[PDB]
């Protein structure tokens with residue numbers, strides 16, 4: 001009965017969507033843009049997307065949602081079998097989220113929505129991203145996947161964060177992070193050949209006009 | 219065996235320290251300040267503190283270290299047994315980290331280290347902290363603990379984040395967040411009565427001059 005609330009232009013939503021698809025699980029998509037409206041905050045407490053509705057109620061936060069799905073659902077494992085290896089996947093997932101996705105996100109207004117961001121914000125984003133990509137290069141195994149030889153949750157955070165982060169680099173900061181990170185470049189192409197990727201990208205394109213109208217409205 | 223790398227002034231280090239003490243676990247403390255030095259990056263890949271050393275190698279990131287401890291170690295459980303309840307604890311912990319601790323942290327230079335922060339950063343922190351405290355109010359159960367009737371990992375993130383965020387509020391932003399959040403004020407006093415808190419605070423005070431000296435040079 002799992003329901004995934006969010007929208008197909010959301011990168012964090014697509015991470016959960018890809019996990020569900022990779023694991024062959026049944027789910028219903030519900031269009032939800034989150035935000036600060038009182039009715040939105042009742043679904044998602046900080047107004048963030050995605051949210052997973054279960055028999056027990058709503059769960060928000062991609063990393064938390066993925067762990068819940070891994071614990072409770074069947075289908076292909078997206079973690080290794082040993083505790084320390086599981087924690088390494090989660091370490092890499094958290095590094096990409098905190099030190100690549102979130103800093104890149106501070107510039108998405110400029111890179112994607114045509115609205116310049118403050119110089120101080122770009123300065124901090126540049127430093128944080130340089131440090132984030134350096135952490136990933138140092139800690140990632142890329143064998144070929146982020147954590148080693150098998151697809152794991154960390155690869156979902158990677159493939160839907162590093163693409164946008166690189167676009168922010170080239171468009172906003174004059175830096176092509178992937179140009180000198182061939183391990184990462186190879187993985188991004190490899191994740192692009194995932195059999196569920198065409199579905200993800202098709203749904204994203206199909207959903208883009210409504211999302212942009214939502215933007216221009218508020 | 220377990221070694222905990224970091225320093226007792228670090229709030230993230232203290233969260234893991236408290237989890238280990240609360241679980242009755244043996245561990246060794248190793249003074250480590252992280253940073254961008256090559257030798258430090260070998261231990262902690264983003265240069266952050268704390269890091270746990272296990273028989274298998276180093277793990278960084280407090281939330282990750284706490285989960286690893288819960289999954290592998292003996293002692294008092296700091297999560298409920300049911301998987302949805304565990305996820306709700308982790309949601310609350312993540313929300314405190316991302317929406318309270320990290321925005322507050324953008325202002326620590328001023329609140330703690332005598333270095334004034336830019337207005338743009340102060341105004342962002344104000345709006346983020348107001349929202350993060352609202353999220354915690356609406357999602358937390360405070361019964362009396364963050365997630366319900368029992369102490370969990372989310373209370374560790376809470377008791378070592380919300381103290382500092384309130385200090386930022388009063389000193390930097392002219393807002394006392396806890397003044398209108400009685401369930402949180404009450405929880406913070408309860409956590410302060412934990413039998414391991416005096417050791418944590420004494421170690422912090424003892425470690426302060428060396429930390430400040432590292433900062434100066």
Ligand SMILES: N[C@@H](CCC(=O)N[C@@H](CS)C(=O)NCC(=O)O)C(=O)O
Pocket residue numbers: 009010011012013033034035036047048049050060061062063316
């Ligand atoms: N910490 C959240 C962040 C997710 C997030 O920032 N989602 C974006 C869409 S990709 C969002 O909810 N934006 C709408 C808003 O912030 O109001 C998570 O990990 O799931």
Ligand SMILES: N[C@@H](CCC(=O)N[C@@H](CS)C(=O)NCC(=O)O)C(=O)O
Pocket residue numbers: 098227228229230231251252253254265266267268278279280281
């Ligand atoms: N995401 C990290 C945050 C750790 C963190 O910011 N620790 C601080 C000390 S409390 C630190 O390593 N600061 C020194 C530095 O950034 O170089 C975690 O969750 O453990």
